[PDB]
């Protein structure tokens, strides 16, 4: 937390708004669980003993300010780092704090949505008993064309005794991991609004899971509208901000 | 400033705005951000400046306000000038609706013979020096 006497040649703050997409899709193709779990993570480098305020586009805040008719974020299960004054949040919606030095996490929130999953996965599966098995999987990116997921990993279970793997895919790379009884399809760069295909068969129950990161993106529409800084000295200080979406817990059931 | 003169294309759109069906669009998820570009709330200076460009080139004055029309303006400014589209809110009726954004020189006045109530954008420079919304409703401010 804060101490006195801090000093920098340059005063700045960075905010990382990070959203983690939770997913459970039942085997059938119907969605059990869709959830966003976010946090705001801050690197602070501020001399002296400043005073911070965080404007978000916060449904309530807008509702109370005659700005209700605007697009906002109605954001649940909000919990704050310690230094945040609640007496102010309780009444105003105001996020008011004296920030620690450097890295620390300012707040967390949750959202519920039924909205197209960012990455959709169908795997069809043809098994010939005691003989061979076949996997036809299709990955589809359902987020905006002009964004791009990174380091996407699709993890699909194959049977603990399968052998002799073979696969083809137009995009990415597939590998066998016997120790986890899974195959792993890795696409390094995954543009939005696209369908990719990978084929796999072997020879002769946990969910399909995916991992992805999307920079310059959020699924919640959360804007950090401004960050106010007051310190007694005439202070030149700049806030910086980015948004990052990532998977957290994201799974398609299989059976 | 010349891309500020992609306004006719916006103004154009702003205007003209056993059964038939809406073609539901296929929605793409998420809210992208363009990489280093600063997004900020609307400013007194910009709101004043925008205001005036608009009263000159025309099309806003006495056009009839629907939220649909409003929104096309806001997105335009959001995409070209990078101001979050929360600023063009007005004070509630009935009556004349006042800008909540000090510096925005348009208000919503009702009107009868030409036809809840119907309104039009109307320009008022007094809105620039007199924050009517704030005194009508300091509850919204600080």
């Amino acid at each position: 937390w804060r101490s006195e006497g801090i000093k920098y040649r340059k005063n700045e703050v960075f905010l990382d708004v990070i959203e983690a997409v939770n997913l459970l899709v039942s085997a059938n193709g119907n969605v059990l669980r869709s959830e966003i779990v976010g946090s705001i993570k801050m690197r602070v480098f501020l001399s002296g003993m400043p005073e911070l305020r965080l404007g978000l586009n916060d449904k309530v805040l807008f509702d109370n300010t005659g700005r209700g008719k605007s697009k906002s974020v109605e954001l649940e299960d909000v919990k704050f780092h310690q230094c945040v004054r609640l007496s102010r949040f309780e009444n105003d919606r105001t996020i008011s704090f004296i920030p620690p030095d450097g890295e620390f996490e300012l707040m967390s929130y949750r959202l519920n949505t039924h909205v197209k999953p960012l990455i959709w996965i169908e795997s069809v599966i043809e098994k010939h008993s005691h003989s061979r098995i076949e996997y036809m999987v299709k990955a589809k990116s359902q987020f905006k064309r002009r964004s791009t997921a990174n380091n996407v990993e699709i993890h699909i279970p194959v049977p603990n005794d399968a052998d002799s793997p073979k696969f083809k895919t137009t995009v990415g790379s597939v590998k066998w991991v016997p120790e986890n009884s899974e195959i792993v399809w890795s696409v390094k760069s995954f543009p939005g609004g696209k369908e990719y295909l990978m084929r796999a068969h072997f020879g002769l129950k946990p969910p399909i899971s995916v991992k992805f990161e999307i920079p310059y993106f959020t699924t919640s529409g959360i804007q950090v509208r401004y960050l106010k800084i007051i310190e007694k000295s005439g202070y030149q200080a700049l806030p910086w901000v980015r948004y990052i979406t990532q998977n957290g817990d994201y799974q398609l059931r299989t059976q | 400033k010349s891309s500020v003169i992609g306004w006719p294309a916006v103004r154009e759109r702003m205007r003209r705005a056993c059964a038939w069906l809406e073609a539901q669009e296929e929605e793409e998820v998420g809210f992208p951000v363009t990489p280093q570009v600063p997004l900020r709330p609307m400013t007194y200076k910009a709101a004043v400046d925008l205001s005036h460009f608009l009263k000159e080139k025309g099309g806003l004055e006495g056009l009839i306000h629907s939220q649909r029309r409003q929104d096309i303006l806001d997105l335009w400014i959001y995409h070209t000038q990078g101001y979050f589209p929360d600023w063009q809110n007005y004070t509630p009726g009935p009556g004349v609706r006042y800008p909540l954004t000090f510096g925005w020189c348009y208000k919503l006045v009702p009107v009868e013979p030409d036809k809840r109530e119907v309104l039009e954008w109307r320009f008022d420079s007094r809105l620039a020096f007199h924050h009517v919304a704030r005194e009508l409703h300091p509850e919204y401010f600080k």
Partner: peptide
């Protein structure tokens, strides 16, 4: 080109409403 992407500068007040 960095990390989880590049930062954009942010505003210091709600110029929309007072300041």
């Amino acid at each position: 080109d960095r990390k989880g992407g590049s930062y954009s500068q942010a505003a210091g007040s709600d110029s929309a409403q007072g300041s």
